[PDB]
Design an enzyme around this catalytic site. Structure first.
Site, mmCIF file in Angstrom:
data_model
loop_
_atom_site.group_PDB
_atom_site.id
_atom_site.type_symbol
_atom_site.label_atom_id
_atom_site.label_comp_id
_atom_site.label_asym_id
_atom_site.label_seq_id
_atom_site.Cartn_x
_atom_site.Cartn_y
_atom_site.Cartn_z
ATOM 1 C CG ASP A 168 2.472 38.375 43.760
ATOM 2 O OD1 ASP A 168 3.541 38.366 44.414
ATOM 3 O OD2 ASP A 168 2.062 39.370 43.127
ATOM 4 N N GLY A 192 7.614 38.061 47.505
ATOM 5 C CA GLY A 192 9.036 38.172 47.244
ATOM 6 C C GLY A 192 9.642 39.311 48.045
ATOM 7 C CG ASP A 225 1.678 41.325 39.416
ATOM 8 O OD1 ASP A 225 1.891 40.639 40.438
ATOM 9 O OD2 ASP A 225 2.344 42.350 39.146
ATOM 10 C CG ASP A 233 3.806 43.590 46.735
ATOM 11 O OD1 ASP A 233 3.187 44.352 47.510
ATOM 12 O OD2 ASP A 233 4.779 42.896 47.099
#
Ligand SMILES: [Mg+2]
Ligand SMILES: [Mg+2]
Ligand SMILES: [Mg+2]
Ligand SMILES: [Mg+2]
Lengths: 209, 211, 209, 208
Positions: free
Chosen positions: A41, A110, A164, A43
């Site tokens: 991912d 995302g 996260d 961020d």
């Protein structure tokens, strides 16, 4: 609460029942396995991107999170504000390890998709990822013109996914692959912080930076 | 540092975690759902009982300068027939023992203590932890041999599927048998030093099990 | 549900506002000061005496704390059961330090007094306290023919008092002297554990053993 | 060393540090008339690493030579702090001092530039009233500037907050109360300092 709350040794030694792992243990668990596809991912997993999100909020939604729906915000966020994004040491170690293995590295996000984006270059540059192992950032979403996170993990046959957020872990579980948690930094502006280990997943130690 | 008056600290050191697999009693219980009654074993010293009071008195009485008291038959007589009256039961153990009693598992206690003609340890254990006669079993005094792990034979013969202990040799014994070895933290005030490195074999370690 | 509560880096690094100190720092704070009188609480301060109290309760009051009022208990506790008491390393360091300075050491306890006691002997032997710095244990209490804790601190002009309980600290406070907290071990049978630092006092690090 | 393990002595081990909370600091000032207090800026009230990171990557990707490049400071002091994240611990300290009616001063070791918008960013982010705000002070060892110590004395500051060793020694030299703030683990200014190394008070949970 109280001015001088104090403490006691039971509280000082108390541990949450979490399955912590180190990068070294992860590497050891992959020994002998042929190169594979792995995903990250972005961020708060490989980049502390809060600087841009903070400025975006201040600029377009001082009193709310509406900026996240403002196309004007995303143009700037995906085309340069990541020059202010700080790469995480935990991610550097993980990427270096996968690069040594010759694995194919994918980044799934995302973030809202924009016409152009310089994030892929920022990542390849910051983590010194060789051309053969780098792949352009993937913007997952519900839009009819884009696949979901789960769909991408399956299509690229990713065997491990680092993230996260809770949805990062559940997506891995949904696909039946190994989901590994990265700790979100305390100074991140994306709050509250999630409960790492809430799904019984492995959590990388000292991965907040 | 020990030579540094004001060493100070930093947030990286404050949040630093060892890569250990921590588990709770509830998680263990949950991992045994659907499992029929089985035989499980427990080490005694620093696992279910804080027995240092008796070992401390034993050392002072028989070997103030060394650990020869551990090889003294006079010490074991006193230790296995009364000194555990001074031994404090561990709360973590109470929770594990209750959990296994509910499941209907047969509980065994395997100890490295030396065997003596008579012993009241079994009773002290059954009384302190309220273990029903149906689940209780007399303590197995396996003794301690050099260059050999005395516990292996017993875990195999009694077909124990899980073994709880605070020492490395408790965990390696479970590993040698191919069963689940789970670590219990040894109290910091135990007289049995140095403290072992819980999680040193990648085993599950029960949180807050030092008391 | 809550089988996996997980955690986050904010919780991992959270610190209680406590004034922690080490023995070396204490020693350094006393440099140049002439020998003085200092006092120590006994139970859970210099000795882990829970073994005796545990047996006492199981023997005389398995359902309450009435055993604390039973003269038969105190006869056993003060005349031999401390042979099962484990001396604390923190205490050892503190006592050696004060002996080096040439201070006069006093031990004050809330234990009931008995016609004879071997506690003083156990203390001097376990801690190798020379006769010059050693003083017979002082038994204090609300009871008659006895002086309270405060009265004893004033009479001997104790400048420092070490203890694990709140009344040890408040007593020091009431006499205007330096009260320093020692952590009570988590396996002590005297519960609940107190909040070290609840009065803004100095607390010795790692003093639970 | 793949599985180092741990033990309870290690888990409960504490460093001998004097920790304090904002509430305890406020309590220690009870009954005191308004006064002047100063704050360091970088890693004390602002997580400004984003700007320093871009500066490093732009002017000296392999070193800290960018800290002496005039082009870097022009951008850093005139807009890059729009990416600087204010610290919650600072927000609390400042509200607390504002409530007391104290005069707040910000003293920085950043190179001084002709213009600066830092003072503006601080006032806005922390909603500091005009009556308590003061333009940022750039301290330096240049004959045109006054050193950090001189400024503290000049403005008669009684308390100085900072994350760095020189922030604390400066207060110690002036005979005033120096209080330490924790530098975030993800700051690009490494290594992290040892908070408490001077036996000074350190604010709990002040890394964010
Ligand atoms: Mg994320
Ligand atoms: Mg044991
Ligand atoms: Mg006490
Ligand atoms: Mg600073």
């Amino acid at each position: 609460s109280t001015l001088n709350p104090g403490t006691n040794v039971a509280k000082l030694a108390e541990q949450a029942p979490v399955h912590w792992v180190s990068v070294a243990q992860i590497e050891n668990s992959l020994t002998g396995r042929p190169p594979m596809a792995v995903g990250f991912d972005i961020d708060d997993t490989v980049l502390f991107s809060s600087p841009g999100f903070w400025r975006g909020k201040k600029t377009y939604s001082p009193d709310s999170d509406d900026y996240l729906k403002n196309p004007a915000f995303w143009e700037k966020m995906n085309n340069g504000w990541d020059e202010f994004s700080i790469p995480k040491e935990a991610a550097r170690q993980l990427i270096d390890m996968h690069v040594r293995r010759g694995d194919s590295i994918y980044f799934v996000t995302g973030r809202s998709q924009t016409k152009t984006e310089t994030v892929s270059k920022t990542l390849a540059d910051n983590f010194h990822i060789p051309a053969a192992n780098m792949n352009p950032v993937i913007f997952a979403g519900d839009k009819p013109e884009q696949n979901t996170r789960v769909q991408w993990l399956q299509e690229k046959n990713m065997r491990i996914f680092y993230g996260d957020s809770d949805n990062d872990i559940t997506a891995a579980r949904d696909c039946g692959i190994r989901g590994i948690r990265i700790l979100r930094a305390a100074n991140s502006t994306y709050k509250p912080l999630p409960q790492a280990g809430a799904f019984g997943e492995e959590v990388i130690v000292n991965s907040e930076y």
